[PDB]
C-alpha cells in the first residue's frame, strides 16, 4: 500500500560508521579531544546527554505509556470541538434519550399570557439585532465572531429586564468560563463529556420536572435507532490517558449550583469552521446531558438507577441568526443497557430570528431597492427564547 511521507523529506540516515570501530582491540583516534569536527579524524560516538535539572522552557515529557493516568481501556471524550457525523441520532444513542419535536407545553404557555410579554418587545428585539449587526463597532460590517456573542448577551439582558414582573428572576446569575465533566458507560463503551465555552445560566433553585412519571415509564417501549455501519463513537476523541472525573465546575457551597440554561455559540467567521445545524443540536444534547448527569452524580451518588427526581437542563444554541432550543430531562443513570427508562429531550430546531440583514443600502440604477436593517424578522423565535428564560421563575 502507498506509504505517506516521501523519503527525501525524512530524516537522513546516520553516516556509515568508520571501519576502525569494527576492528577489535583497536582504539579509534577521533576529533573529540579537539572539540570540533575535522574531515581526517574519525567521528566520535557520543554517549546520550541528560541536562540533569529542570528547565521549563526545554522540558520533555515522559513517554505516553509511562504517564500515571495511562489506561489500556480507551475513553471517548466529547468536547466542545467534536463534530458528530450522524448529528442528533448519534447523540440520542450516546445519552440513551428519546426525542420529542417541539418545546414542552409547560414552557411555551409561559409566553402565551400577554402579561409576560416585554413592553415594546418587537421594537426592542429589532434594536438588539441592529446593534449587533450594524451599530456595534466602528467597522462597516461586524463579523460573526463579534455580533454572535453580543446578540445573545443583549437578548438575555432584554429578558433580564423582567425582574420587575417576576422577583424570582433575581435568584439567577450568568456565569462565564465554567466547565463540567461527566463519565458514563454505553454498551461497555466508556464515554466522557467535557463541557466548556458559552454561558451557564445558574439558578439557586432546580428547574421543575417536565414529564410525569407516566411518560417516563412509557419510554421503555421506545427503541434507540441504530445507524450501522458507522460506530456510535465516531468523531469522538479516543483517549488512553484520562481520569474518571465527575465535576459540576464549582466547589461545594456555590450559591448558584443548579444549571438552568446553557448558551452555546457557533461564532466562527469561516463557514467550514461552523457546526452544521444537526451537529450543533447534537452538541447541545450532549452538553445538557453532561450537566444533568454531573448534578445527578453529585446529589444522588455514583450509583446506576432510575432517578426518582429527574434533573432538567435547558440549552440554547445559535450562530447569531439561527437559534435552536432544547429542554433535556435526565430520567435515569442506568445507561449501560439499551432497554429501560430513557431520558427525554424536547428540541425545537432551525428557528430563524431574522432571514437576512443589509448593512448597506442595495441601490440598483440610483434607486434604493432594499433599505438597511433586518429582513424577515420573526418575533416567534424570541418568544421561545423568552419562554425558556422565564421557565422556573414566571
Amino acid at each position: 500500500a502507498y506509504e505517506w511521507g516521501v523519503r527525501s523529506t525524512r530524516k537522513s540516515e546516520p553516516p556509515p560508521l568508520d571501519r576502525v570501530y569494527e576492528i577489535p582491540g583497536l582504539e579509534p583516534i577521533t576529533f573529540a579531544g579537539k572539540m570540533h569536527f575535522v574531515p581526517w579524524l574519525a567521528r566520535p560516538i557520543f554517549p546520550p546527554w541528560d541536562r540533569g535539572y529542570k528547565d521549563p522552557r526545554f522540558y520533555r515529557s515522559p513517554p505516553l505509556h509511562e504517564h500515571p493516568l495511562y489506561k489500556d481501556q480507551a475513553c471517548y471524550i466529547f468536547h466542545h470541538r467534536c463534530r458528530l457525523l450522524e448529528g442528533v441520532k448519534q447523540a440520542l444513542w450516546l445519552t440513551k434519550t428519546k426525542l420529542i419535536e417541539g418545546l414542552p407545553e409547560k414552557v411555551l404557555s409561559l409566553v402565551d399570557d400577554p402579561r409576560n410579554h416585554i413592553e415594546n418587545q418587537d421594537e426592542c428585539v429589532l434594536n438588539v439585532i441592529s446593534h449587533a449587526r450594524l451599530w456595534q463597532t466602528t467597522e462597516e460590517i461586524p463579523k460573526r465572531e463579534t455580533y454572535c456573542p453580543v446578540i445573545v448577551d443583549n437578548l438575555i439582558q432584554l429578558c433580564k429586564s423582567q425582574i420587575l414582573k417576576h422577583p424570582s428572576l433575581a435568584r439567577r446569575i450568568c456565569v462565564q468560563n465554567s466547565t463540567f465533566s461527566a463519565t458514563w458507560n454505553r454498551e461497555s463503551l466508556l464515554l466522557q463529556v467535557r463541557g466548556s465555552g458559552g454561558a451557564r445560566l445558574s439558578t439557586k433553585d432546580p428547574l421543575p420536572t417536565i414529564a410525569s412519571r407516566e411518560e417516563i415509564e412509557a419510554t421503555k417501549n421506545h427503541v434507540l435507532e441504530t445507524f450501522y455501519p458507522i460506530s456510535p463513537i465516531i468523531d469522538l476523541h479516543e483517549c488512553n490517558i484520562y481520569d474518571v472525573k465527575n465535576d459540576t465546575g464549582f466547589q461545594e457551597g456555590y450559591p448558584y449550583p443548579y444549571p438552568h440554561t446553557l448558551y452555546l455559540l457557533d461564532k466562527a467567521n469561516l463557514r467550514p469552521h461552523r457546526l452544521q445545524p444537526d451537529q450543533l443540536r447534537a452538541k447541545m444534547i450532549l452538553f445538557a446531558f453532561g450537566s444533568a448527569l454531573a448534578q445527578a452524580r453529585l446529589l444522588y451518588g455514583n450509583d446506576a438507577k432510575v432517578l426518582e427526581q429527574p434533573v432538567v437542563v435547558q440549552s440554547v444554541g445559535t450562530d447569531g441568526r439561527v437559534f435552536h432550543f432544547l429542554v433535556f430531562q435526565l430520567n435515569t443513570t442506568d445507561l449501560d443497557c439499551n432497554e429501560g427508562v430513557k431520558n427525554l429531550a424536547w428540541v425545537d430546531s432551525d428557528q430563524l430570528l431574522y432571514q437576512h440583514f443589509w448593512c448597506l443600502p442595495v441601490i440598483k440604477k440610483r434607486v434604493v431597492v432594499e433599505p438597511v436593517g433586518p429582513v424577515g424578522f420573526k418575533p416567534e423565535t424570541f418568544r421561545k427564547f423568552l419562554a425558556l428564560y422565564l421557565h422556573g421563575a414566571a
Binding site: 535539572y53 529542570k54 528547565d55 521549563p56
Partner: protein, 101 residues
Amino acid sequence: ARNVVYPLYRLGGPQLRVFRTNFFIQLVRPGVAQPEDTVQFRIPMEMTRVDLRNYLEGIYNVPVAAVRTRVQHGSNKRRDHRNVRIKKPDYKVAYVQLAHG
C-alpha cells in the same frame, strides 16, 4: 560592567553581582526644555535602563521613578584631508525622572 564576560545563569543559581563597576556616566544639560523632575545622562552603550536605576540608587542614593534611554547616531559625514570619513562616536542618552516629587 563592559568588555567583560557575564557568568551564565541557570534556574536556581546565585545572584549575579558586580563589585567594582567600570560604567562611568556624565550628567549633561538638556538641549531642549524638559520637565522639572527629569535628569539627562550620557551612559555607556552596554548599560541598560535597569542598570542605571540600580547604579544611581546604589552609588548615589538617588530615588528614581522612571528611566528611558535612546541611541544617538554620531555623524559620519566629516572627511579628513585624505577624503576618509571621520566618525563622531555614537552614544546612549538616558532620561531619569526623580521619584518623590
